Design a protein around this ligand. Structure first.
Ligand SMILES: *[C@@H]1O[C@H](CO)[C@@H](O[C@@H]2O[C@H](CO)[C@@H](O[C@@H]3O[C@H](CO[C@H]4O[C@H](CO[C@H]5O[C@H](CO)[C@@H](O)[C@H](O)[C@@H]5O[C@H]5O[C@H](CO)[C@@H](O)[C@H](O)[C@@H]5O)[C@@H](O)[C@H](O[C@H]5O[C@H](CO)[C@@H](O)[C@H](O)[C@@H]5O)[C@@H]4O)[C@@H](O)[C@H](O[C@H]4O[C@H](CO)[C@@H](O)[C@H](O)[C@@H]4O[C@H]4O[C@H](CO)[C@@H](O)[C@H](O)[C@@H]4O)[C@@H]3O)[C@H](O)[C@H]2NC(C)=O)[C@H](O)[C@H]1NC(C)=O
Length: 105
């Protein structure tokens, strides 16, 4: 069967949610950490060594363990995401697809 391997991500309106990617604990050989806005392929966060790494606001954070945070999570802040976190060789040492949702409990 051909399916995805994404993370069923959930939230609630007026909330703050995260993006837990790491299936591992790399450290010694890693370089780049990336997160995109899959909906329209729109850069939200990135790491490219200590010469150029960025995160516009808290609304989208890039962390050490490699998680991506997001503050304020209403219907508007619910989107689709993906993480590509590469090593020094420039390989995609791990890749994954995510999807923020909103719930009604
Ligand atoms: C990857 O990394 C991520 C982070 O690096 C990580 O996410 C983090 O996860 C942890 C938990 O795993 C989260 O921590 C929780 O925090 C709750 C309280 O939070 C509020 O207070 C914090 C501390 O306050 C600072 O600021 C005050 C200023 O007024 C000072 O007075 C304080 O002294 C203190 O200062 C310190 O920090 C400063 C930096 O800000 C620093 O300068 C200073 O020197 C000093 O060190 C605030 O930081 C925090 O603010 C954040 O969050 C709010 C939203 O709430 C935002 O608005 C802010 O903008 C900001 O982002 C808050 O105000 C705790 O209650 C909670 O405790 C529970 O969990 C622990 C651990 O398991 C238990 O021991 C404990 O008993 C509690 O358990 C209870 O609940 C659970 C349910 O969860 C339940 O099961 C259990 O039975 C029990 O009932 C916890 O500690 C942290 O917030 C996350 N983010 C960050 C940035 O750390 C992520 O998980 C990682 N990913 C992976 C995959 O591993």
């Amino acid at each position: 069967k051909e399916i995805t391997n994404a993370l069923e991500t959930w939230g609630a309106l007026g909330q703050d949610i995260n993006l837990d990617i790491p299936s591992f604990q790399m450290s010694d050989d890693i370089d780049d950490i990336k997160w995109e806005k899959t909906s329209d392929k729109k850069k939200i966060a990135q790491f490219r060594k200590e010469k150029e790494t960025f995160k516009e606001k808290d609304t989208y954070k890039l962390f050490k363990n490699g998680t991506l945070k997001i503050k304020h999570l209403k219907t508007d802040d619910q989107d689709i995401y993906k993480v590509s976190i590469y090593d020094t060789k420039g390989k995609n040492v791990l890749e994954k697809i995510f999807d923020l949702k909103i719930q009604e409990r």
